[PDB]
Amino acid sequence: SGAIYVGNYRVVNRHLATHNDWANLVWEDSSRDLLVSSTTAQGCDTIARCDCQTGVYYCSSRRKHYPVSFSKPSLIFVEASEYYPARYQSHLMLAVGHSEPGDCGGILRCQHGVVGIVSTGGNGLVGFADVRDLLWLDE
Numbered sequence: 634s635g636a637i638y639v640g641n642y643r644v645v646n647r648h649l650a651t652h653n654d655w656a657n658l659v660w661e662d663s664s665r666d667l668l669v670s671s672t673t674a675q676g677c678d679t680i681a682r683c684d685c686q687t688g689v690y691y692c693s694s695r696r697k698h699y700p701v702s703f704s705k706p707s708l709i710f711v712e713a714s715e716y717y718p719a720r721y722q723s724h725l726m727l728a729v730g731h732s733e734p735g736d737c738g739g740i741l742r743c744q745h746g747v748v749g750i751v752s753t754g755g756n757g758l759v760g761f762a763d764v765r766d767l768l769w770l771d772e
């Protein structure tokens with residue numbers, strides 16, 4: 634579990650969304666695993682606008698923060714599950730590090746702010762869904 638709160642928006646994993654997230658829907662995308670909904674209060678998370686390839690992420694299964702090197706956003710094959718069948722997920726970044734299914738929602742950060750959230754993992758690797766291209770979140 635985990636979400637990003639910026640201004641009047643809430644950013645969550647599409648497969649972990651609630652009934653209140655769908656009733657106050659702004660934008661959704663299956664191939665990215667993302668969902669955005671509206672909120673009454675004003676959030677204070679700073680979203681980064683950069684080309685960084687190193688940062689720090691939170692891992693709830695270990696209760697630790699870990700520094701990692703990661704790849705550029707691209708299409709990567711994701712195996713079948715109970716939420717989505719076998720497909721290619723777009724805007725995905727990979728890193729070497731520990732990960733478990735309950736860790737989806739953990740925030741990735743750099744010196745400029747928020748980069749993305751935990752989405753995929755396994756075999757000793759970890760995947761992050763990028764949010765730096767969505768300029769409408771700041772306006």
Ligand SMILES: COc1ccc(Cl)cc1CC(=O)N1CCC[C@H](C(N)=O)C1
Pocket residue numbers: 648666711714716717732733734735736737751752753754755756
């Ligand atoms: C961080 O999640 C994991 C970590 C380790 C392992 Cl063995 C497995 C997982 C779970 C995982 O990758 N998915 C199941 C939920 C939907 C995800 C998606 N974005 O399509 C894919």
Ligand SMILES: [Zn+2]
Pocket residue numbers: 681682683684685743744745746
């Ligand atoms: Zn940066």
